[PDB]
Amino acid sequence: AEFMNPPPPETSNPNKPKRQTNQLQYLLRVVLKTLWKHQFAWPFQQPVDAVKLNLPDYYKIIKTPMDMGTIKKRLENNYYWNAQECIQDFNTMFTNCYIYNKPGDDIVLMAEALEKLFLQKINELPTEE
Ligand SMILES: CCNC(=O)[C@H](C)NC(=O)Cn1cc(-c2c(C)noc2C)cn1
């Protein structure tokens, strides 16, 4: 933990209500699994370290950070109540990339590849049972 980076998003909290659903299960076993192993996943596998990357303004611009390392912890810890909360995390991660970086930057193309997979899988999100 460098003190000039924020604390990561919460991945545990006993006061937050929690539930398993078939949809959250799919999000872990199918969606995360698929995206995590992708060739271009590695920048999204942990919070942005703005100190190491020499991007002092990152957390001035990006006020709601998210990454797949956090999402994986949230899924594995059953932090979520529903699939929408998890899907919103993924959407936040993509949008933060697209807001902070120039169109056609490598990092943007990488995010775009992951988001394309994501959309395919979320289109097949099972009916809640
Ligand atoms: C703590 C370990 N961390 C790394 O291994 C290093 C520090 N990360 C990288 O080199 C690659 N990276 C680029 C970004 C990024 C994203 C996402 N959106 O905009 C930017 C800019 C995030 N990670």
XYZ file of C-alpha atoms and ligand atoms in Angstrom:
152
model
C 0.000 0.000 0.000
C 1.516 3.277 -1.139
C -0.252 6.024 0.879
C -0.778 8.138 -2.280
C -3.019 5.396 -3.706
C -6.560 5.171 -2.211
C -7.658 2.117 -0.231
C -9.100 -0.445 -2.682
C -12.884 -0.935 -2.966
C -14.371 -2.866 -0.075
C -14.433 -6.668 -0.548
C -15.682 -7.624 2.960
C -18.216 -6.010 5.270
C -20.510 -7.881 7.719
C -23.118 -5.065 7.601
C -23.698 -5.433 3.855
C -26.461 -7.975 3.035
C -25.272 -10.930 0.948
C -26.835 -13.699 -1.082
C -25.821 -16.446 -3.515
C -27.812 -16.601 -6.747
C -27.487 -18.755 -9.868
C -26.731 -15.494 -11.724
C -23.845 -14.550 -9.359
C -22.544 -18.130 -9.719
C -22.529 -17.714 -13.527
C -20.732 -14.384 -13.124
C -17.882 -16.134 -11.236
C -17.662 -19.494 -13.041
C -18.333 -18.250 -16.610
C -17.887 -14.472 -16.960
C -14.949 -13.746 -14.644
C -13.221 -17.033 -15.610
C -13.470 -16.087 -19.327
C -12.210 -12.504 -18.892
C -9.453 -13.324 -16.392
C -7.576 -15.681 -18.735
C -7.787 -13.376 -21.740
C -4.420 -12.245 -23.215
C -5.245 -8.608 -22.398
C -6.602 -9.088 -18.820
C -3.414 -8.343 -16.864
C -3.861 -4.492 -16.541
C -7.375 -5.097 -15.115
C -6.418 -7.822 -12.601
C -5.665 -5.425 -9.722
C -6.373 -1.786 -8.789
C -4.540 0.850 -10.806
C -1.288 1.682 -9.010
C -1.088 5.383 -9.919
C 2.224 5.761 -8.090
C 4.084 2.987 -9.983
C 2.609 4.154 -13.301
C 3.481 7.805 -12.595
C -0.116 8.899 -13.157
C -0.635 11.378 -10.260
C -3.948 12.625 -11.643
C -5.545 9.144 -11.994
C -7.504 9.282 -8.739
C -8.334 12.968 -9.336
C -10.148 11.958 -12.535
C -11.379 8.504 -11.525
C -13.501 8.848 -8.387
C -15.189 5.430 -8.582
C -12.380 2.932 -9.283
C -12.940 -0.752 -9.976
C -10.897 -3.692 -11.237
C -11.310 -7.422 -11.795
C -9.137 -8.335 -8.803
C -11.717 -6.603 -6.596
C -14.617 -8.190 -8.533
C -13.050 -11.660 -8.166
C -12.694 -11.128 -4.386
C -16.306 -9.881 -4.161
C -17.582 -12.937 -6.054
C -15.400 -15.408 -4.111
C -16.458 -13.804 -0.796
C -20.137 -13.588 -1.759
C -20.132 -9.802 -1.214
C -22.982 -9.136 -3.640
C -26.774 -9.286 -3.220
C -27.592 -9.547 -6.920
C -26.046 -9.826 -10.384
C -26.754 -6.156 -11.172
C -24.277 -5.003 -8.469
C -21.569 -7.171 -10.061
C -22.413 -6.132 -13.621
C -22.248 -2.496 -12.513
C -18.699 -3.129 -11.192
C -17.608 -4.476 -14.599
C -19.265 -1.530 -16.338
C -17.524 0.895 -13.997
C -14.115 -0.673 -14.747
C -14.651 -0.352 -18.517
C -15.959 3.216 -18.311
C -13.063 4.347 -16.069
C -10.642 3.095 -18.759
C -12.530 4.861 -21.560
C -12.808 8.111 -19.598
C -9.189 8.332 -18.444
C -7.373 7.195 -21.627
C -7.323 8.435 -25.240
C -9.403 6.468 -27.803
C -7.176 3.957 -29.563
C -4.603 3.873 -26.726
C -3.418 0.260 -26.195
C -5.168 0.101 -22.799
C -8.419 1.128 -24.477
C -8.141 -1.615 -27.145
C -7.453 -4.103 -24.377
C -10.558 -3.049 -22.416
C -12.584 -3.156 -25.634
C -11.551 -6.793 -26.252
C -12.611 -7.766 -22.687
C -15.876 -5.807 -22.922
C -16.775 -7.586 -26.164
C -16.437 -10.974 -24.395
C -18.298 -9.569 -21.420
C -21.312 -8.461 -23.484
C -21.581 -11.889 -25.182
C -21.608 -13.646 -21.806
C -23.986 -11.209 -20.097
C -26.436 -11.581 -23.011
C -26.555 -15.253 -21.861
C -26.942 -14.472 -18.129
C -29.346 -17.221 -16.981
C -32.858 -16.612 -15.852
C -32.825 -16.292 -12.065
C -33.909 -19.509 -10.345
C 0.045 -3.420 -8.732
C 0.459 -4.077 -10.020
N 0.305 -3.177 -11.159
C 0.913 -3.376 -12.338
O 1.333 -4.476 -12.696
C 1.153 -2.140 -13.215
C 1.449 -0.924 -12.336
N 0.091 -1.855 -14.179
C 0.378 -1.606 -15.469
O 1.527 -1.435 -15.874
C -0.777 -1.651 -16.468
N -1.935 -0.847 -16.135
C -2.489 0.140 -16.863
C -3.597 0.575 -16.170
C -4.593 1.581 -16.580
C -5.942 1.178 -16.651
C -6.566 -0.138 -16.310
N -6.686 2.163 -17.081
O -5.823 3.248 -17.305
C -4.569 2.880 -17.010
C -3.515 3.900 -17.209
C -3.699 -0.295 -15.059
N -2.694 -1.153 -15.044
